[PDB]
Amino acid sequence: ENITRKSDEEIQKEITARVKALESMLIEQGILTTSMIDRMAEIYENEVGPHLGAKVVVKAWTDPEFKKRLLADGTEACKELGIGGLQGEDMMWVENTDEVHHVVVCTLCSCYPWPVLGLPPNWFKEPQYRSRVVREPRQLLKEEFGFEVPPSKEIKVWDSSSEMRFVVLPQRPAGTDGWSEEELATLVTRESMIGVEPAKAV
């Protein structure tokens, strides 16, 4: 609650007018077109999403030598699957174990490995998660994601202050011995690769 704040409807209506105004001037300057806007949207709506990250995960789970290359150099390993580019030119993948839990944040803005996860969800970019995860990670994981990391287990928080993008390789769920790459992929979530959830059980 903020008694000084307009309704969501009034905010949306004012933002809409300001953006259409700005868009009209950028069109007249030739640096924005309807086709350019439609292409950027189409790419991150339907081409680039966490299904890409999921392939990298299931390959590392089923291929020990690919996993070593992923952990050595995430960019080069992801290029093996034709996966890379904008806002993931420099990826460092980090491995969940029984000893260690990894969770990633951009405290300064929203930085996130677009090429494997697509655009970050709104909660990731907002001040609540960004402020709290570097300071109370165990409590945040418990209260927001229902994810209890036992106190004896170290929580490593990766703050992307640089163009280095941090990506979590979550642990392979138990009871998935000999599963196909496609079956294993149904267990890999956006959340599992941020480190705010494990991969799905069962």
Partner 1 sequence: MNGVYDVGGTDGLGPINRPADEPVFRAEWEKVAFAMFPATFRAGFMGLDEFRFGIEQMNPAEYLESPYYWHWIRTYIHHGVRTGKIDLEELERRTQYYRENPDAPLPEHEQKPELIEFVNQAVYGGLPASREVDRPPKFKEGDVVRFSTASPKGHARRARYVRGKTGTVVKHHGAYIYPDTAGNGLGECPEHLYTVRFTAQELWGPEGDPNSSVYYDCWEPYIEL
Q: Is 109 annotated as a binding residue?
A: yes
- SS3 assignment for 126-139: CHHHHHHCCCCHHH
DSSP H or E stretch at residue 69: helix 64-72
Q: Which of 109, 131, 161, 180 is catalytic?
A: 109
Residue 106 is among the residues annotated as catalytic for this protein: yes
The listed partner (Co ion, partner 1, a copy of itself, none) that binds 182, CB under 5 to 8 Å by sort, is none
- Interaction of residue 155 with partner 1, rule CB under 8 A: yes
Q: What is the CA radius of gyration of the chain?
A: 19
Residue 109 is among the residues annotated as catalytic for this protein: yes
- What distances in angstroms separate CA 66 from CA 7, 44, 119, 120, 135, one per listed residue? 51, 26, 25, 26, 33
The interface with partner 1 within residues 28-47 (CB under 8 A) comprises 28-41, 43-45
The interface with a copy of itself within residues 86-105 (CB under 8 A) comprises none
Total residues at interface with partner 1 (CB under 8 A): 90
- Interaction of residue 13 with a copy of itself, rule CB under 8 A: no
Angle between helices 50-62 and 64-72 (to 10 degrees): 120
Chosen residue from 18, 35, 146, 151 binding a copy of itself by CB under 8 A: 18
Q: Which is nearer to a copy of itself, 14 or 45 (CB)?
A: 14
Residues pairing with 105 in the sheet? 159
The interface with partner 1 within residues 131-150 (CB under 8 A) comprises 131-132, 134-138, 140, 143-144
C-alpha neighbours within 13 Å on the C-beta side of residue 68 = 2
CA 143 – CA 138 distance, rounded (Å): 9
Annotated binding-site residues for Co(2+) read 106, 109-111
Annotated binding-site residues read 106, 109-111
Contact residues for a copy of itself (CB under 8 A)?
A: 3-6, 11, 14-15, 18
